[PDB]
């Protein structure tokens, strides 16, 4: 492949967190952190599965950073999914960076990289069934952007050098479906990229990109909610950024804020004596926006391989 991948995890095996640690290629500029926070407990209160999460993080051979975050279904078919990333989804990152410098429309460019992704699953990879949000940084007018979208319940948050933190791509839920790239969402593609998440932004330099998949619900607040007429409630949750401040990275802040509120759920949990079960899979990815030289520099080492 032509893209340089600086992070990389397929899924993480039960009861191991992992934690990847710097690359020297990118200046610290990107980190996975995966844990589970699937809590399951007997009648005594005593503990009692893999992930199916994927992130991966890199840059294009010009030097343009993306992250991708991905959560499957079902277990069974968790290779698939990883498959169909590396096989289908990371090779049109590059391209889709370029279409997004070249066409007026960046909505247009990423609804049809959505379509995409949609006929590719279906002639290749019929058991990859997963939620994805994704994003690409693209450089026009002499500035740096970064578009991308979601679909499902993973999301894309930014916390700007000022300290601000912005939702890009939000959890969508709608009642009584599960939107997904899957057999079942690819009957109607424009309803579902309609009610899910499509963004475009500019982006300087030391802006932080944060995707994950699952968090505790109560650390998520509904940026929005309405009704879709196929009569259906659709909701938009945001990472609430009351639980955060201005000082330390939000890869950082997210980790420290969401341990805390799992050793309460535990404690919680543990001290009723009874049957919990709750959580899942929680993986998150961080992505520094580069600067000039750093995108020199990685475009420089995309040609010598
Ligand atoms: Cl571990
Ligand atoms: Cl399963
Ligand atoms: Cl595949
Ligand atoms: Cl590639
Ligand atoms: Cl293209
Ligand atoms: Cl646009
Ligand atoms: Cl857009
Ligand atoms: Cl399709
Ligand atoms: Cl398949
Ligand atoms: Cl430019
Ligand atoms: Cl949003
Ligand atoms: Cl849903
Ligand atoms: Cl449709
Ligand atoms: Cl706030
Ligand atoms: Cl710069």
Same mark, same amino acid.
């Given at each position: 492949?032509?893209?340089?991948?600086?992070?990389?995890?397929?899924?993480?095996?039960?009861?191991?967190?992992?934690?990847?640690?710097?690359?020297? +290629?990118?200046?610290?500029?990107?980190?996975?952190?995966?844990?589970?926070?699937?809590?399951?407990?007997?009648?005594?209160?005593?503990?009692?599965?893999?992930?199916?999460?994927?992130?991966?993080?890199?840059?294009?051979?010009?030097?343009?950073?993306?992250?991708?975050?991905? =959560?499957?279904?079902?277990?069974?078919?968790?290779?698939?999914?990883?498959?169909?990333?590396?096989?289908?989804?990371?090779?049109?990152?590059?391209? &889709?960076?370029?279409?997004?410098?070249?066409? !007026?429309?960046?909505?247009?460019?990423?609804?049809?990289?959505?379509?995409?992704?949609?006929?590719?699953?279906?002639?290749? =990879?019929?058991?990859?069934?997963?939620?994805?949000?994704?994003?690409?940084?693209?450089?026009?007018?002499?500035?740096?952007?970064?578009?991308?979208?979601?679909?499902?319940?993973?999301?894309?948050?930014?916390?700007?050098?000022?300290?601000?933190?912005?939702?890009?791509?939000?959890?969508?839920?709608?009642?009584? &479906?599960?939107? =997904?790239?899957?057999?079942?969402?690819?009957?109607?593609?424009? +309803?579902?990229?309609?009610?899910?998440?499509? &963004?475009?932004?500019?982006?300087?330099?030391?802006?932080?990109?944060?995707?994950?998949?699952?968090?505790? !619900?109560?650390?998520?607040?509904?940026?929005?909610?309405?009704?879709?007429?196929?009569?259906?409630?659709?909701?938009?949750?945001?990472?609430?950024?009351?639980?955060?401040?201005?000082?330390?990275? +939000?890869?950082?802040?997210?980790?420290?804020?969401?341990?805390?509120?799992?050793?309460?759920?535990?404690?919680? =949990?543990?001290?009723?004596?009874?049957?919990?079960?709750?959580?899942?899979?929680?993986?998150?990815?961080?992505?520094?926006?580069?600067?000039?030289?750093?995108?020199?520099?990685?475009?420089?080492?995309?040609?010598?391989?």
């Amino acid at each position: 492949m032509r893209s340089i991948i600086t992070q990389i995890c397929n899924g993480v095996l039960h009861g191991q967190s992992y934690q990847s640690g710097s690359n020297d +290629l990118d200046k610290g500029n990107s980190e996975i952190f995966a844990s589970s926070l699937f809590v399951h407990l007997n009648e005594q209160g005593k503990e009692i599965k893999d992930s199916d999460d994927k992130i991966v993080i890199g840059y294009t051979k010009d030097g343009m950073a993306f992250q991708i975050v991905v =959560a499957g279904f079902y277990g069974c078919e968790r290779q698939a999914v990883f498959s169909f990333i590396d096989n289908y989804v990371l090779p049109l990152i590059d391209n &889709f960076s370029l279409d997004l410098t070249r066409y !007026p429309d960046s909505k247009k460019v990423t609804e049809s990289l959505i379509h995409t992704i949609y006929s590719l699953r279906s002639k290749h =990879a019929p058991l990859a069934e997963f939620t994805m949000s994704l994003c690409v940084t693209y450089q026009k007018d002499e500035q740096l952007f970064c578009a991308g979208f979601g679909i499902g319940d993973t999301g894309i948050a930014i916390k700007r050098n000022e300290g601000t933190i912005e939702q890009l791509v939000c959890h969508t839920e709608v009642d009584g &479906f599960k939107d =997904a790239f899957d057999n079942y969402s690819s009957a109607n593609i424009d +309803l579902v990229i309609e009610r899910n998440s499509v &963004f475009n932004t500019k982006v300087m330099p030391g802006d932080e990109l944060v995707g994950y998949t699952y968090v505790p !619900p109560m650390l998520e607040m509904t940026e929005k909610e309405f009704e879709v007429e196929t009569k259906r409630i659709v909701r938009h949750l945001n990472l609430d950024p009351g639980n955060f401040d201005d000082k330390d990275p +939000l890869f950082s802040q997210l980790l420290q804020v969401v341990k805390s509120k799992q050793k309460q759920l535990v404690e919680q =949990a543990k001290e009723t004596g009874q049957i919990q079960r709750f959580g899942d899979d929680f993986t998150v990815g961080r992505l520094v926006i580069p600067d000039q030289l750093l995108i020199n520099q990685l475009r420089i080492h995309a040609l010598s391989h």
